[model samples]
Target: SSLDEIRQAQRADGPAGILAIGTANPENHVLQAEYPDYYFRITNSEHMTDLKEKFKRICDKSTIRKRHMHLTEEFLKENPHMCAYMAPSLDTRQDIVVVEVPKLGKEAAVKAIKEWGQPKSKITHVVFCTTSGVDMPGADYQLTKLLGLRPSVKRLMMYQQGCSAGATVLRIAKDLAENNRGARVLVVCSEITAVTFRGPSDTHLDGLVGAALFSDGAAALIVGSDPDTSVGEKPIFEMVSAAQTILPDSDGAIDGHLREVGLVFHLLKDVPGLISKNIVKSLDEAFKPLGISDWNSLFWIAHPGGPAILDQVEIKLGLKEEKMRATRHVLSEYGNMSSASVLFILDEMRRKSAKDGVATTGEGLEWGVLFGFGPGLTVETVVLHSVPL
Candidate 1:
């Protein structure tokens, strides 16, 4: 009798939910309209007048107003080796990311904890994600120490998960929270363009597209089950279900490798087509068990991978433009920050919904779904139920 009773006491009864969210970006930023000029000037690539014009066209059509960057103009100028399209600059880049990533993660985590209204001691687990280099001790260790979390806190680090890192971590956080009683998991995703920065190449316009799209940022959230209302804990988005799928024959659609010349990213132009073609199947499998239909009935928390991707999804899913307002807003304000973009979108939607006095936190809907896409090319879907405000 006691063995069965003990087993039930080990797990939580309620679904895991997001209790709070925080996001941060480097102070230095460049306007998208002017990015081509700024980038060309910094990399000393003004000699490529034709490529500069093409890049300008890409930026103009990017649908992004501006993007924050951790690398400053002076830093770029001082480190001329980094501006070269190919060079032995990996060490220089990794050194910076090793230190800067955790610090940025700390800033976002501090804000999240402040909003959570809980002491660091209460956080039982930490899940850190990044697209940066793999380092010993990992960012998770540094972040936990920076936050002064208990030494006994469980830690997991996810390296090079790309744009889907945000959603991926949430899936793990949900499991950790619901599987262990009284578990409070801190999930953080930090990204920097420092490692990915390289000059434009005549043969690789995909690199130009990446330079125009990616930015630097960090986001953090607290996930837990059965919030202690007595301690002012409130549920934000209840984690209902999570699923993942890989698009067929999409091995090279989005791929990146860390090499002697920093990150070598190969992004095929067909990624949007591939995602649109397979998204329905992916969503069908994710929502089939819940018996949910009518896409418009649920709020959407989609990653703003790019204008083309978002445009394709809008058409394929027949989603209203307003439904993706928050996703677009994050893209416009922050660009695509790899693993950190989805969280920023979630934060933006909730804040905007509250400001407008919406009926519920999930953009006025009780039920919603969150999507994140990255190399594999992978699609991560999480079912969410918004807590009534």
Candidate 2:
């Protein structure tokens, strides 16, 4: 029986490895237009001029007009019972629910995975990455049950890794699939940055910048040793390479600290310059060995960390406006979904056009260099090649 099955299996062609990304956002709306005065006051140089300028530049470039969230004022107004249930204490300083990020995040994760389609019984691993929240029965366990994943699915949860966590999960999944062929892995990232929004006593630029630039969303991606036979025209993209770079003595460049109220995110004003001078070089070094010599030949799926970071990447990599349109669109529409942002951009790119089947004679294969920066002044980069059908 074993010999017969082996012969039949050897004759059958297995599937190729690929990544399918699905994204979802909560129902909260706060537009720049809705808070112009807040923007003007926050932008005043005395408050945080550098951050203000960065926000202005990013807003100008981002084509997104609005974003949705779950904690909308309308939701709060209509569901007073749920609000009271989540946070019995109305006061922010006295409520533990203020820090209960995973509760809200679970909802987002569920929504995103549902959009991604059914959970295959073969999924051997489930990876959950988040910087916005953590608790017992963490994201992995809770999400597995919520999404009806296989009871035997292995679980891994990663936190405090910040924006790079999304790519990190992909790298981890790739390693697993490579080692264990036929493995199916699902990676989920959710951030309700609005929960971390706290008006500091000093109200400096760094604090205000975090408040204005971050929003709430979640993304789910499925990866496997074999590509899904069900995927239509746009097959999930393939992962080619991944690299991580940690800047020395730059631990304080960006910080995410837990506070009595909620999480506090801080960034030094000089980060753009530092990244331009250092991070870009690291990316170049990482890609050099992969035979990627020309930056112009690659599509950049860079994290919209904010306006300054995007600008710095564009300048350092010699990218033109049209090249960064999707990145800009995500920044404007969703703010920064932390680890989920790059996936959002990829989904947008897929929806907009097929990178594979353009009718040009000289158009080369479309390849992308994905990048995300976070704590430790760290960067995670992934190079992907788009294979046309």
Candidate 3:
């Protein structure tokens, strides 16, 4: 039978599903509303009334209330490092990411292992993902040492895939687990956007826009053929299918680089519209083979690429605000933790399921669709199913 032959799928051996999940965050949390003034003090910014007011206006529209960061507004304020004049140097940002990202990622990975209660020796594969930072040995190696996994265990780094990497990690893990029965894969993502873009330049408008929404956070997930989830919970997803598309003719719409100042993210205002135009067709072709005929039956667990992108998705998919509740909420709470944001939204959904006073409404989310945007202006989508609530 073909792989899509769902009837032949054994309950224990379908697409690799999430067994356990957890997240770690820095100690610093700052309210977004206060950032305009915070930056006014720390960044050498417009003393003129008009530029300052325009900056405030742009920030207010970002639809984020606050964000957690490794480099706090206060941290930058306290640093004596100077770029042009009292600006944050590229060295300072790189140093923070080098030390903090792996440490934070390892904390989450350990928490996932501890919470899942699986023997650490059982993990056969480790996949580390990030866009905000890079290292020589890489965070994957750091985590292996921290988690005490076997030396021969396989490791892969999906580096600099941008925000879509969370979906990328799940897809790769699913493929690996399906091929090797009993294989256990740990997927870890940490984004220290604060460190990446800590450069507080006076003239880079994009830098300020980038700063308003990016945050620092880490998320870890466990997926494999045989997880001992025998005791508790119901209807966690079996990642059924995944499809990715890198839009053609989108050469310069979005880009990220580790520049001398720091990781500078560039985006054209037309990015959201351009992405929407391309992916509407791609989503149809990809989900069709999975036996999904209508999107209305599916819950869209999307990456929150800020409010404008969310709004574009709402229009492209013909959905209401309710569908995007989790996205907006995560953005407000954590900004864009890059690859880690989607996991936060999933955890939030888990909390809401109980708060809604249902024994388990996992059945309602039986048909879930996940997608995220990244560099290459790419979109990755995954289809998943749930057991009865």
- Residue range 1-389, candidate 1, lDDT tens digits: 69889879999989999999999989889988888888999898999999999999888888999899999999988999999899899999999999999999999999999999998899999999999777999999999888889999999999988987788999999999998999999999999989999999889888988888999999999999999999999988899888898889898788888899998888774988888889888778777788877788888888888898889988999988888888999999999998999999888888888999999998889888899999899999988998786
Q: Count clashing pairs, candidate 2.
A: 5
Q: Record all residue pairs in model 3 with backbone atoms less than 3 Å apart, i.e. clashing.
A: none
Ranking 1 against 3 by TM-score, winner: 1
lDDT of 3 by residue, 300-334 (tens): 67888878888887888787667778778888878
Best by lDDT: 1
Query: Judged by lDDT relative to the true structure, which candidate is superior, 2 or 3?
Result: 3
Question: Candidate 2: lDDT of 320?
Answer: 73
Deviation in Å, model 2, residue 36 alpha carbon = 4.7
- Per-residue lDDT tens digits for candidate 2, residues 30-133, read 67655333444432333645655655654555444665554545434443332221223223421323243444445545554454454567567888877765
TM-score per prediction, in order, is: 0.98, 0.78, 0.89
Worst 10 residues of 3 by lDDT: 80-89
lDDT, each prediction? 0.90, 0.63, 0.74
- After superposition, which runs of candidate 3 have C-alpha atoms over 4 Å from their true positions? 1-12, 46-48, 78-88, 199-203, 229-235, 357-363
